[PDB]
Amino acid sequence: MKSVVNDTDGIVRVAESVIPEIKHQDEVRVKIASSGLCGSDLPRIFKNGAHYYPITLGHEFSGYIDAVGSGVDDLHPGDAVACVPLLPCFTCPECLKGFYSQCAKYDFIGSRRDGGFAEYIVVKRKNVFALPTDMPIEDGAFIEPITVGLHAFHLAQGCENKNVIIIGAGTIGLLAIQCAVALGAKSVTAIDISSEKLALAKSFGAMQTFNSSEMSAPQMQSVLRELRFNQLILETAGVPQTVELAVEIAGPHAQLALVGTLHQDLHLTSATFGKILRKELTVIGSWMNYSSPWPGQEWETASRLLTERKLSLEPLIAHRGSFESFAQAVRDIARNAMPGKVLLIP
């Protein structure tokens, strides 16, 4: 079987190895139909970090069950499934309350482990989610990134009838916009520094857009005045300025979902911190994309949205193709400012 696997930075192109076999009673073998390249998995791509180089990443994929272990009785060869990349222990106190993302002894396909840039992969039954037969199988690669946004909505007890504001017009943010619209948000606002990404956001249903390199927070809040109640704000950009921005624009009692991780420190003036208290904001930390019963309602919702064709994925796709046309992957538009998702389609 062919594959796409890397090591200490700078190398790739395509490899060739033996098909994995089921080695445990609760494993399945998946024949991969679609597997996508994410920004999380990125800067191990050459930004290093020990880890064992060895082996490669890839946690956003779908395909069909090829074989199941002697202990698997709820899945058969040919069943459509998507990857559920996290593997919690399922038995610790955090796991028993459905806090899978707070499990101390986690595991992760395409990170801790390895994931799916190959024709086949063997994983635990718990790491696959059965898909509707009516779901286009290649859109299964988007379920995991869709659930990132849905899990924030879930933590905020839903986006329905709320004035949703998405900060950051990356793939996750763009999917959140489409989901918010599909899920009955009163309104959807997108904020980003790129006018092209905002144009994309508007085509996805964001009724208005703010360019944060052109508008100040006061100007934004002024325009938001009609929509200042029942806000649900998603910070997806993961930069200090946009966390600060979210607090400054926020209406009375807004919910503020933090989905983006920071890599720089956050400096809040006394004034800005004071606004958290004065507006009585609720700031909600969001981590990964799971809830109980495992893997969570987010996965059902994403699945449902994708089968009933509520989402537009083509504009989020920078590339489709088989191994040869994906061994491609890496070229040199540099390592990022990514157009969009890059798909492997065996």
Residue type, 243: V
Shortest distance in whole angstroms from residue 84 CB to its own copies? 18
Residue 101 contacts its own copies per CB under 8 A: yes
The 3-state secondary structure of 46-108 reads CCCCCCCCCCCCCCEEEEEEEEECCCCCCCCCCCEEEECCECCCCCCHHHHCCCHHHCCCCCE
Binding characters for its own copies, 127-166, by CB under 8 A (x = yes) = ----------------------------x-----------
If the CB atoms of residues 218 and 274 are measured against its own copies, the closer one turns out to be 274
For residue 167, list its beta bridge partners. Answer: 191, 235
Please pick, from the candidates 8, 47, 264, 293, the single residue that binds its own copies as defined by CB under 8 A.
264
Q: From the list its own copies, Zn ion, none, pick the one residue 281 interacts with, judged by a Cβ distance below 5 to 8 Å according to partner type.
A: its own copies
List residues near Zn ion by CB under 5 A: 38, 40, 88-89, 92, 95, 103, 267
Selected from 125, 197, 279, 341, the binder of its own copies by CB under 8 A is: 279
Of 289, 308, 287, the closest CA to residue 299 belongs to: 289
Q: Which does 92 bind (CB under 5 to 8 A by kind): its own copies, Zn ion, none?
A: Zn ion
Q: Is 83 part of any known ligand binding site? A: no
Q: Does position 268 bind its own copies by CB under 8 A? A: yes
Nearest 10 degrees: Cα torsion 57, 304, 94, 154 = 110
Q: Judge whether 345 and 322 are in contact, CB under 8 Å.
A: yes
Beta bridge partners of 118: 3
Number of residues forming the site for its own copies (CB under 8 A): 38
Residue type, 35: S
By CB under 8 A, tell whether 252 contacts its own copies: yes
Neighbours of 33 (CB within 10 A): 21
**Pick 1 or 268: Cβ nearer its own copies:** 268
Closer residue to its own copies in complex, CB, 113/228: 228
Taking CB under 8 A as the criterion, the residue among 53, 64, 287, 294 binding its own copies is 287
The strand pair at 187-192 and 163-167 is best described as parallel
237 near its own copies, judged by CB under 8 A:
no
Range 201-207 contact pairs with CB under 8 angstroms and sequence separation of 24 or more: 201/166, 201/169, 201/173, 201/174, 201/177, 203/315, 204/174, 204/177, 204/178, 204/312, 204/315, 205/177, 205/178, 205/180, 205/181, 206/166, 206/177, 206/181
89 is in an annotated binding site: yes
Q: Which is nearer to its own copies, 24 or 97 (CB)?
A: 97
Considering the rule CB under 8 A, would residue 108 count as an interface residue with its own copies? no
DSSP lists the bridge partners of residue 15 as 3
211 forms part of the interface with its own copies (CB under 8 A):
no
Q: Is 273 in the site for its own copies (CB under 8 A)?
A: yes
Residues that bind its own copies in the complex, under the rule CB under 8 A: 93-94, 97, 99, 101-102, 155, 229, 243, 252-253, 258-259, 261-270, 273-287
Binding residue ranges: 38, 59, 89, 92, 95, 103, 144
